[PDB]
Amino acid sequence: RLSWYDPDFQARLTRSNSKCQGQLEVYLKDGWHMVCSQSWGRSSKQWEDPSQASKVCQRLNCGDPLSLGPFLKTYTPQSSIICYGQLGSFSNCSHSRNDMCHSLGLTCLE
Known about the structure:
Elements: E1 11-13, E2 21-27, E3 32-35, H1 54-59, E4 65-70, E5 80-82, E6 94-95, E7 104-108
Parallel strand pairs: 3-5
Antiparallel strand pairs: 1-2, 2-3, 2-7, 4-7, 5-6
GO biological process, one term: T cell costimulation
Subunit structure: Interacts with CD72/LYB-2. Interacts with PTPN6/SHP-1. Interacts with CBL. Interacts with CD5L. Interacts with CD3Z/CD247.
Keywords: Cell membrane, Disulfide bond, Glycoprotein, Membrane, Phosphoprotein, Receptor, Repeat, Signal, Transmembrane, Transmembrane helix
C-alpha cells in the first residue's frame, strides 16, 4: 500500500546536522513519523545495502547513499514507528511500544 519507492511517498531526513544525513522521517496518513531501526525484522546494526534508499536521497536532492542503519538514539515512543512485513513497505506501521527503539539514519552524499 505504501513503499518508499512510490512517487506519492514523502520523506525527509531530520534536521539533525545535515539535511542529507539524519533520522528518516516519513509521511503517514496521520503525518510525519520517524522510523525506528528495529523495523521489518531488521536488527539495529548496519546492514550491507544502503543503495535501496537512493530514491530517498533523490527526493531530498542529495547524492548517493553512503550508509543506512541505526543513527544515534533519539527515542520518541510516539513519533518513531516500526513496520512489519517487507523491507521498504510502510503500509500501516505500528508505534514503537518497545523498550529498545533506535533511530534509523540515512547518510546521502552532499
